[PDB]
Design a protein around this ligand. Sequence first.
Ligand SMILES: COC(=O)[C@H]1[C@H]2C[C@@H]3c4[nH]c5cc(OC)ccc5c4CCN3C[C@H]2C[C@@H](OC(=O)c2cc(OC)c(OC)c(OC)c2)[C@@H]1OC
Lengths: 381, 380
Amino acid sequence: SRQLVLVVVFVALLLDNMLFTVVVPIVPTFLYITRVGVLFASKAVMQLLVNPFVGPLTNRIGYHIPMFAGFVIMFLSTVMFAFSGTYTLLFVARTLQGIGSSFSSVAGLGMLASVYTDDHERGRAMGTALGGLALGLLVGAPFGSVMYEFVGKSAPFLILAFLALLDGALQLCILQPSKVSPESAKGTPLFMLLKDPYILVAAGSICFANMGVAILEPTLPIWMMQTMCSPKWQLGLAFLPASVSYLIGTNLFGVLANKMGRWLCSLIGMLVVGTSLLCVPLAHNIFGLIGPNAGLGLAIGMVDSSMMPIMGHLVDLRHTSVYGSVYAIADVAFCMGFAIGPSTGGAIVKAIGFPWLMVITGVINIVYAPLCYYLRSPPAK
Amino acid sequence: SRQLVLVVVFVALLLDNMLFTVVVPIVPTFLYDMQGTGFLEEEITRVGVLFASKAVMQLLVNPFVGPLTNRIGYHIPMFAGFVIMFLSTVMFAFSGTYTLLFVARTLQGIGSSFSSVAGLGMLASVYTDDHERGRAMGTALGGLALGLLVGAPFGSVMYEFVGKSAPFLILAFLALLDGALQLCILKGTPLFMLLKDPYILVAAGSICFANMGVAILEPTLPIWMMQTMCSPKWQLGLAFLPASVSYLIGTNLFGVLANKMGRWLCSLIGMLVVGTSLLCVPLAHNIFGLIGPNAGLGLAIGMVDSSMMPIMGHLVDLRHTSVYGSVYAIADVAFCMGFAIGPSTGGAIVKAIGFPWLMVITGVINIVYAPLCYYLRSPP
Ligand SMILES: COC(=O)[C@H]1[C@H]2C[C@@H]3c4[nH]c5cc(OC)ccc5c4CCN3C[C@H]2C[C@@H](OC(=O)c2cc(OC)c(OC)c(OC)c2)[C@@H]1OC
């Protein structure tokens, strides 16, 4: 094992989100705005479409085979990135990274849900898994930055590949993905899960918080150059507090959510993220963003740790104990924000403006915040 | 004398707040006295309409009090306040019928309006140094908070130990002491013009919606309390004690601290905390579960009251010509609106749907209105 498959998911999410973030400081320097924006969103769009095809499959194949597929797909994704020097290869490698990320994330979260049956222990495990994901997001970009600065471009991809082989050796050691074991219980269909307001409310809260982070992610530096006229070295330093607060919140609230009540934690988290998004566009220097960005990260960790086990609790309370479809919906809500963010952020900012855009983000978060009371006590079947 | 006028206005404001706070755990207890049976569902709407009468009459009487104060000075209008306060105090003690309580509430409202206007006018006229007026108004307004702290447990502690009429007799006797002291005694931008711009209307709406939580929690919390957890009759006054104590700590601390972090952020946080506290209030299964949500509601209401009053002052000073009671006059419209609309709609809501749905609606209203305080910052 119960605790044995926790490091396999921790390591698997650590490297996958490492490849997601390490690509940032190395790609646009090689090619030298809207043309590169579609490249960053290739992972989100393709992985969004492949998400509905991974959920229903898990009822018969199992979780081990998707995890091994995520390992191998990350292997090709890092090896192609290490050697690619053209857009036509970079887009294909990024799409492979996206599909591998979707496979590995869905399989890992499903395996974590299936391994732990107690509610509090499952919440703690999901908190530590999201902590590993936040740690990977924190360590990705500076790692590639220093590698491309002193050592070279292909070196970080090779190092991530070596770590990937080590992770795959771990998977072969513990999981043993050699046989197809179908789950005895037949999972509920994915379309029927969209007719349950509990799952829709939880997925909407997760998607709205992740959209609130993924909109501020790509368009913040453009506003920084347009208004503050700041040096380039602290562009990642501005978003560093968001990652650090994300890691701290997801590591600390995994035990606190059970005691404080999940619905109250989700409500307070979305209120905090709405207030932080409101307060972000009023800063006039880099020092004013450490507060609101840290609050945004803490609120996102609040919502994630509160509503990741709430999907499993709802599925156990109402439907059968097959966790693939609900967490597939959760991953879709996770990744549609990253699909919407970098492609359309510049267009929306040029159309309406950045402070207005954060106004709608905070307003929608605050207005949908009272809807989290519905999850206080979903009646059983 | 300077001390005499200050003590007169302080005891008058305290008496008004005490009479407001002392009827909360007495009216439902009497109406039950005529656990047990849940027959109060048929009378909840009448209980709310009795509470709304004072606010309705006060809202009707605020525009009128100005001309009489201008024509015939200030001391004569204040004398009517004490006598009507005496009549309301005696009538509340000797009341036995539902009809008489409405008359007592209406007289209490008219006396409160007359006493407030006359006392603040006399305090403004007596002190003319332009600097001690702030301290005098501060102590006069803090008398209301002290009376609010002392009044709520008083009514629910003297009813079951001494008698129903005893707190009303003591309040009337306290009012009578000022009569001997009161016996030995001796312009622009009207309110309807000030409410036109949206910066002041949003402020008044924010204050009214923040106080509407306690306004709706007054008439229906005791009935729900006896219906659902069967506590003895002397916990009802103590249950609202956290709602006052947390209000005092909130108003002091955030009057100290709000200007550093921003007035609009404090208002938004207070509105959100009001919404979450009202949402978490009806989930308690015992009296000990209410010290948390009530304390949070009091703290958030203190946040809103301490943060939005300076915003109203700056807004009224920036564009229009203000007087000493300009912020008081606009603020009094918000509290009167809230107290008039709260219980009357709340009783109908608890009759039509369940009691927790009323708190759900008020919390949702507070949460959706909390974004609208963003407009107040950097006014033109
Ligand atoms: C009845 O007592 C009041 O009516 C006062 C309070 C209203 C409300 C309240 N009622 C309760 C009754 C309870 O019994 C069960 C228990 C708890 C509460 C609470 C807790 C929360 N609480 C807050 C109190 C607010 C007070 O009003 C001001 O503080 C004020 C200050 C000013 O100076 C800045 C003004 O001028 C600008 C001004 O303009 C008119 C008003 C208000 O009137 C004086």
